[model samples]
Target: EPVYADAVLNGWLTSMGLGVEYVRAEGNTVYYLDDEGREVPVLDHACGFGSLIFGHNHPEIIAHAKAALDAGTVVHAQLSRQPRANQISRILNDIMRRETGRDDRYNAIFANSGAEANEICMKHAELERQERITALFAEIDAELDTAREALTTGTATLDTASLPLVDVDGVIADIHRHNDERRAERPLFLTLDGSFHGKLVGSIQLTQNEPWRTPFTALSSPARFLPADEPELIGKIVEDERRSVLTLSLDKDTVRVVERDFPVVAAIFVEPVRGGSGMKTVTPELAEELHRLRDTLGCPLVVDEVQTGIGRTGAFFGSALLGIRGDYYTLAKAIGGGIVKNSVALIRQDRFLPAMEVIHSSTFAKDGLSASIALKVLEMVEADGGRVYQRVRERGQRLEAMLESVRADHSDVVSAVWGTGLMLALELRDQSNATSQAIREKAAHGFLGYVLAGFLLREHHIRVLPAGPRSGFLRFSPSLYITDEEIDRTETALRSLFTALRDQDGDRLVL
Candidate 1:
């Protein structure tokens, strides 16, 4: 007799309204036990939402993990720095330099999840801004002292007018007048509309989804959302809002005003490809614009690579694939080789403020086991001159072609296919628009995608995902090691789905 928590698990799942269940997971496949005690295979096209890029339970990752465990490797050495941690950080820095062709030296900070990594990056930007502000205030104070000395003793030889010393309010007015002459500054965070940074407080503030942020408005930070398609707007916004502060005069005869636009901007968070919002591709023009703005504003450009990093987009880094350079990059999801949970934020050394290292850290951050697995994953990607990435490109083209064919065949139901590499989505037509309001309400919330997914699961034994309820796209993110035969299988399943939709014959294909 099999032993399991069937009743309790089923009760919990029922309460949550989750109908899907999987008994076991292997490489690129999952198994569901039937009522007859038979094991049924299901193609895992979702790939754990891009986490299993190497596929489920990859042999090398598992073997390396086991080896580390058997060797009694220190799992949690919070105080002592481990070799694996240092090696992983070095590997990440080298990868960034090699892939992006950026000349600047980079540093890495490890975290346990993508949210934490993003949080760390946000805090780093804020700290850097605070330091700049502190320096600016110090200069202002020095200038004020010199002005006061000149006005009081008349001993200081200055060309500027020596004000008469009056009441305490007069000193306040002088300071206020000086401040008015200089530009005002405040920390501003920028993100694109439809962007998903993370679910944590700091990261969530950067996320653009309204429903996700509505309840947590009290904890949210001030973030400006801009159009994802229009990359030129970033520079325009910065130019319009940025101000210049006063610098020390060179001649010592007059106030020297220096233009410092975008000095107040803490950071701009972006996704090379909007993965959560239906895999929207980033245009080359936008990429170039972001690169130019990063140089012009001197603010850190943070790229969130939680879904597109680590060979998922046929490159070591998604920003590199897009031909963009980011001052800071966050990586997670597949970094642990599908074995351990790991995330990291890479900062260019020149932009990295080392004095604020202790400002953000976690107990499980940079744990030995996660570092070991992450290092192994990087080594595997580097082996054979990255044949894995080449394979991803080839497979991605084939998959895109297959999806395009499906859209062409069923033009009535399928609208378009979008995405790059292994990360792809199929946009479904809104069939409910012609139906009743009740039907529309039910169908509007990912109903068509869900019905199609159910059909694929039951009839074709395939598991894919709807991008989201509002997205109206079905996501297809298979593993990098996915075989040609598996692609053929996926093609067949998609063809069947298209045929059923075209015929409008399947029992599950209801509007």
Candidate 2:
């Protein structure tokens, strides 16, 4: 038998309140040592932050992974062609084609993690923009040379009839002006408020939380934070940014002023459902508006589906449910089937820049083992006519109903219940000043999430997680394979927990 460490490696890990005591996990259940050194079973509601969608140690996924290991599959083959990688890529592209009714209009790029997948998309967009800007600069330089030649030969005399027609030099001057306006410009990257993309340097820049971003400001690129709910404002913001970049004259004719507005935005990264931000979802109208904005701007709409993809939202992709097709879709998490760490970005073929392929490369990306596992995972999802996803929808409805009932019964403590599919949250009401003040005070000392999570674990023997410190929301993202009996038990636990809290005075129930 192996001994487990009781001490956490870092402060933030400790702040999770998981208490470094878990021995093992199976399906949606986790086993930990109790005070008497006896094994205690707890329902795992967090599901590895929504990674184990199929459940911990899913039999099929395990069998596939184990078979690969037994066959001595190559774990890291960077220099040669790998069949598994090709198969997985083909499957992903085919699914996108079928969904969009397009013909080979998407390309796949694999990476080791969600952050890397997002980073790949960001770099691809940036490189494409750089290429466009470079070409424009060349065009401007050529036009300037032509005008200079005309001036040198004294053939650029200005026409002085009626309104004086400007010489070729004037055209050259206008070009130079446009070039200067865009000389110091870079593409404006946009992200939503309450969005969480990833933790790597580039992806972290797109994440909107200040606490996670403040300390790493130097490493991050500047990004525009937009309100997630208001889609009407997006077009205005893009136009305003365009005018600022191109230095458009309001009095000039809009059509003939310049070829394009200055400072071309590379892309807008969006989360159809803000998973890390307490499972906030966008309205259907907002999704449609965003699609319209992307088409109007002629810029790629990159959807980060790291947490919401792989049937977590009752669809292969949450973007599908939203009726929004993205120019780039990054998928990870459950795609690995809780066995392998893998992620891939599906880029629309039209927007896919082939020349930039050699620029970004990862050593462990598209490894044979991970790719094989991911391929098997997709097959499993497709098996039985997608019965797994159907179950997710059913379970999600049941879970939401349970939460809604809890909120209705304990209105003082529960404010709202919201989420889609298996991703759900219970928003706590700021009932009394005591409850509000206690949370604030507890947050200052450590994560208030830990306080509430600790209470739930001690009282209910159910492992649940808070969305974040001071969020006043608890999240539930159990495995899709969770049984009806397990869900009923969880619902009972919630009822008991809230009833106990309601019995106590507001001040006593603060934590």
Candidate 3:
């Protein structure tokens, strides 16, 4: 209890100067109060970094959660058709069909969380394309592990584990050698740069951040990382190296590389938008190029839709917005409704083949409750006729406009605003290593953003989260159901916060 309380309280106060006696205490707006005696109408501004798509305790979602609880649907069932799960799957399939332009290209498998969803996709990929996948090159923090474990037997040979610890190139060579030794039919796995899937044994090897991974050298895998933005470089490298084991980050560079040299790769893995690391997106044109590469290379395109799926990016799946299709897709987050934990692994129906028994199973793979909620959530998104997607675009546009204005006004202090959709970043100018200046700038930026977010809660009662890498920038990912009025309120809050910060810093501020 102390650890939890101390972490929550001290961490918040130290970072965000809001000195509260207790969290979730009475008088604070932890829960909405329709009829407060003397409420000041603070907006709830914190989203757990785009994780809470529908917002805290949305009425409809709450209703579903309660209804299911009351119905005694606590435990999971076998491939049984609980109405909710069936409905969600049906809706999801429909959405997938609409997006991908293919019927039954995928079979849905459900689990309780994003990691689990990734786990399922890996299993499916490994079982389906086991022979071809050897080395995996994931982004700095992408979801490589789940894919690895699901494909492999969840057991790493001593050699595989040891290679990752010693050196990246060494591991890659070892994996290539291992693939060659098999002489049997098989492909290798690899990941690309700026591709942050997640943090697990399998995922860790894909991570680029030395701090998060170096300590866990004992549990790594063979992986190759390349820049996310440079395609020509990747193309040349891939062609020259002939690292038959292929995995891609679905970034601009990789897309470009694949276009030029698709032969070296066995498969391509990409996130529609790079979540966790930064919300990097592929342009529609680039996505099309990647699709062509997949076709030309005779490899599968595995889109990791973990963070941007389900209505986070306004589309059911972010890749759908880009108008790109893939052989396999990975999904998590929004599918779970933020209440239950669920994820999915889907491959084209034709890709499903009876392979040599490479068993892949999980106790919670077919959870009914998650399936039901995710189904309902998908339906809610569809029925809205893309209102949610539009909402993100519109708000994001307004936020960018305000950030640009702020940057222009305080050119010396702030640098630029980056990102697309609801995810964004408030980059500082030449202040690396979080130094005193960095600290001050971070404090100023974070304070302005946090205060804006906090004020939205204390004054407007709205919640918004800070974006990637810990609150350097305020992330605004409200529910797709948010309206123009809400966007206006957010803009006003940010403007007011900037004014307050400028006043506090005075001439001492560079801007």
Candidate 4:
């Protein structure tokens, strides 16, 4: 008896008009059987680049979800602590142990989505040292007992153990200033190079990109960034023996520095494989460095396994494959098990006690349904020897080989093929000014790329995404379930596309 359309309208209004305009009549992206009953295969050209990871209604994931529905699983329970949440935490702990080589050291704080998880990390890090609350009060009324306790707690909290590994230098500078300003202990926050925490305010401040932080410059703590894949910076920053956030990059010299110079940093953060580098992995030497730093530094090491945590990177969490141990680890992306929206903030038990109240929480932090799906997905990935990941790796290898062959055959237009597993990019060669100008103009005015994506959809059902910021780079991140035969189909379609485009006058493609 409920009016569904009215509910949708109400929901749209609540979201301030952020609802989709069109209703989706089609069930799957593989094909569309239209009103006339004519079957049509949906191609990748129309897909927004490669966002449709599992094509449409992926059978396996869908089956799991359907089973949940059949079993009368709750979809949207608003409680913070639920059975599903516990399941998610347990699964995350298992994955962390198996992947990072440390048992119970990693714990999980599940959230409704990645953005919330990111925001939670920021809030916890900002409040970790208890300085902001204590510092202001102590500064105003020194004679007050409340002010005195505030100052004392603030000083105690300033130990480098309270922050992320990437904020070492910033923590040092802040601590030195804190000492000079109030004769108090220094503050700390950790960070690392090539680290992508998220694009939100606090996390963005800790992120390595200038663009991420410049617009919102009101960050409370400055993060310390260590030399990426290098260790000397650790020695240089830890020389003062101040509490700081230390980032480990598996750089041997850095590990040596941590062992010798900066042993008091609160947390060490790292990526097992640099996700932005097309899944470039850390070397064994660097991982050994991580081990040494953890053993020597005697503080928690946090791993930002955000991108590489899921089954996509050929592991439940990439750290296991790299043979490094972390005291804490972050998981996102496919951690939702490709079925629901989820992210987890995990920490070891010992670290969890002090950091529990100070570190992590969210309103929708523990969603029962999402947690269940994530647990089920992790179980599936684990039980199958990571079959999906293996498929992804094999597909990546096949794509690389095919592209290499294509690059050899079309030396003029193609420049390079680079990527790891299924995450890959095809770099186009430099063209003449006239050609470049024409292509740019076409792309700018006619939405040529969008049209081309559409055209590709019309001609072939293969979906692909264009790297906008990195112009002329086409990215292809297919589903882990994609088969070798599909790769061949993609190659053939692309070959035909290249043949058509290579000879076309750029002006002729204008709308």
Candidate 5:
């Protein structure tokens, strides 16, 4: 008789027959006690939403976490006295420098979760944008003073090379009177269509999903969405969106009204490989465009690696593979090693405004224990000179090959299998044509994914789930520690699942 906040979700699970009560988890397997009180182990491929890079309670990670626990590690110290803070930043910067082959250094600002870290990035990027605006206006302020002073002192010059002057009192009054009111700098942010940055108020505006964004968009600054496939369209968007402020300049004894460029773009937000982008990737063309935009327009590129970072996508940072040198990188999830909840926003040293150290902070973030464990996780991945990436690549290929086999065998059931590294998806064909009447109705109602997921869970004792917002793409991101045997078992179970679908054997899956 326990009343929980997730009653609706729990009811949904029960209706779909996926309400298995998992009691324990260890190394890619979750355990549930059956009606007979016998322990049943299920292979876990969802892996806690791609956070379990080393799997549940990985022995070495567990040992290291315990070492920090028993060694009197400071778990609640803040302010300027934390030790692990600088160390984490140093190595993160080092890794990025070495991997992307760039000489950039980053200032790591720790936060409690991925969403909050994105919030921090947005806030900081806006701060930099504000600074740019303030400085630009300040330039005008000083230049206007000089112009006024030159007119007052009769220092106006008629030289053809310079040809900048106005000693006229009426023109001077006109120049001063023209811009008594300052124009506002709109905080504009750019993102790709179908981008999945985070779900917080500010980041949700940056996220391109219309339903999720429609409600909270009024909560933050407006963001423009560019098509992921079209890279060059961004230039026109930026140019068309650019606004200017009125300023006074002297040209050949005439007080000229100059439209000084005022910055509106806060930053260009990207995910290198956007989470919702899935099978249709945010192409290399977009990556190059982001870099070009950053260089040409002087706006920062915020690469959100919340889902793809920390060795989840066969690399330390996904942007490194795509040759994107991000101005800021938001990393979370797998970096915590399936143990702690931690995230870091790595801002380039030049981009890192010193005020952010004091401005954007958390009460529960950047503790010694989380930092120590994060540092150790970095160390474990960096062991053997970063061969873990290669291992991830090989294992990911094997897993994809296994899924590819399912696609090959049952091409009618599986339309496609797509992903890179451990971050993968298996897109089944629409289930509207299901033979069973009840199942076909459920498919139309969008409950088909739950039915398929439950079928796999109940019949095969394997755990995988379907992603919403797009029902057909079932995600598969098991831990790096997932064994070859476990992978083969998954393939066998998937084969059976697809075979049933192909043959219209929907009795087990029918409501």
Candidate 6:
């Protein structure tokens, strides 16, 4: 097909029966041109990988776009004050602050996609890490200078202030040694084992999917992945790797043994719901452990809410609902109202550096059109003091119940169901025992999901996809506007497909 290829992934879609070109979409339906040239409407369960929380082509957002365009709303006025971006920033900060019960403010930095937003946070996090280390060294340097002065004069008596050094020279020697060795090292980052931060060059390091990350391993900084189920193990790892560095008290003439903090960890990256790799929500225990770890590392938590934000998880931020207060946040996907491409990286008041404005920006980011649409999106989402969120929660429960019913009927096929709200998953039994050799071989390589998803699209006119790496798990993150009827269709399609798999009759499901 000599059409707009977008090249590589187009073949992947074609091979999996997902190559439909949509002409129009509305609410929970996407329409494609068929062989008869007729519009074939399909219920969109994938929703642009969960970006369309408002559904497709939202009329309100469209109207806002038209009005703003007609009224000559500024679209690309860079290096200028942005009231539109400012408004969006203010609203997001308020939402985050209110949700987290924090007095601190957040500064919003706009970008072009979720990956860029994650990269922004990552870069800024590294910068802030350097700053934190610099401050520590400054504290150390101040003491060294005082000791040098005292030694030169040989007259100034040092005040212990309830704490004093036995040998100032020994402490100074250790400090110099630690700082010397630290200069040869780079910062390390921490993340969970099951996560999908992004596939961008920098963010690939944060993502835990081996197949996706293996090729790009050497492009970015190093990251240590903690087990998702055992967050205490994260703390243990941090403590276990603790390297003691000497720092002199700035307030008094004293030698102190300060923490080098697990070989210089820069920051921690996490998803409230591990949407891509696991579709699993953080347990209360994990959340508490993360909070404790944050205090220990003195490093910021970069919460990637690209998939779980904007009411997809029945709350403004899934992180807040899970009781994880982040020092940095990245919001995309639904943030643009499914119309434009825009992302925002938010930093806590104290963590945000003013120099970032001059150092970081995207050509298409912070445009008036996107900001205008995003503002309307936030407005509609927060309307009625956020009654929409209640609807999202109820709708999620209903869909979950439907999935649970199907799973109960076909437990042999479905191993388990995980996650909360709209961000959910249905993990199937590994396909090592399929009756058909061709299908079994493909399924062994994780093609079982593509085959099943193809059946849903072809037979039932519903679209969904599997989570990354763990492709046997079909993760469903549909729009909040999905009706009960649409969910019924989903339940029916899933049941029909699972019934075939359970009976070892899924040969026809493969394309």
> Order of candidates by lDDT, top first?
6, 5, 1, 2, 3, 4
RMSD of 6: 4.3
Q: Each model's TM-score?
A: 0.86, 0.87, 0.70, 0.66, 0.89, 0.89
Q: Which digits, one per residue and each the tens of the lDDT, describe model 5 over residues 1-511?
A: 8886989889989888799899988999999999999989999988987888889988888999999899998888777688688898898888887888899888888998998888888899888887887787687777667766666667654233322322444554554454434335358888887787888878888887677889886688888888777776778887888766655576635445466676778888887665565544556777778778888777888888888888877888888876777889998998888888899998988778899998777889998888888998999888998899998899888898988888888888787776678988877777777777877787887777778888889888999887645466688989887888998888888888887777776676754
RMSD of candidate 3 to true structure, Å: 11.8
lDDT of each: 0.76, 0.74, 0.55, 0.54, 0.80, 0.81
Give candidate 6 regions above 4 Å deviation.
1-8, 142-178, 244-263
Give the winner by lDDT: 2 or 5.
5
Q: Compose the digit string of candidate 4's lDDT tens values, residues 409-456.
A: 766666777645655666655343335455556444423334344335
Compared with the true structure, what per-residue lDDT tens digits does model 2 show for residues 251-354? 11111123444446777788878865578887787777778877776667899988888888887778777777788889899888887789999887777889
Q: Which stretches in model 5 have alpha-carbon errors above 4 Å?
A: 142-186, 430-446, 503-507
Best by lDDT: 6
What residue runs in model 2 are displaced by over 4 Å at the alpha carbon? Answer: 1-17, 100-104, 146-181, 243-260, 435-440, 443-446, 500-511
- List the RMSD of every prediction in angstroms: 4.9, 4.7, 11.8, 10.9, 4.2, 4.3
Residues 1-511, model 1: lDDT tens digits: 5657687766643432235678888899989888888999888998878999889999999999999999998888986757776688787778777886776776788899998988888889988877767677677667656655544554433333323211323544655565555434346788777788888877877777778876786675657776767776777776666665443332343432233322667888888878666888778887777677677766788999988998888887888888767788899999888878999888878888886566667889888888888988899888897788898888888888888988888878788888899998998888567344433554665456666776677778888877753647889899877778888888888888877766655344442
Question: TM-score of model 3 relative to the true fold?
Answer: 0.70
Query: Candidate 6 on 1-511: residue-level lDDT in tens?
Result: 5677577887777877788788999988899988999999898878888898888988888888889899998888988988887789899888877887887788889998999998898888878877877776776677678766665456344344522322556656866886768755767788888678888888888888888888888877768888877765776777655654555443343323444442377788889988665688888887777777778778888888988899888889999888887889999999888888999998987777899978987789999888888988999999998898898899889988988898899998897888788888898887877787866876887777887888889999988888757477887878888888888888889888987776676557766
Segments in model 1 whose C-alpha atoms lie over 4 Å from true places? 1-18, 146-186, 235-263, 436-439, 502-507
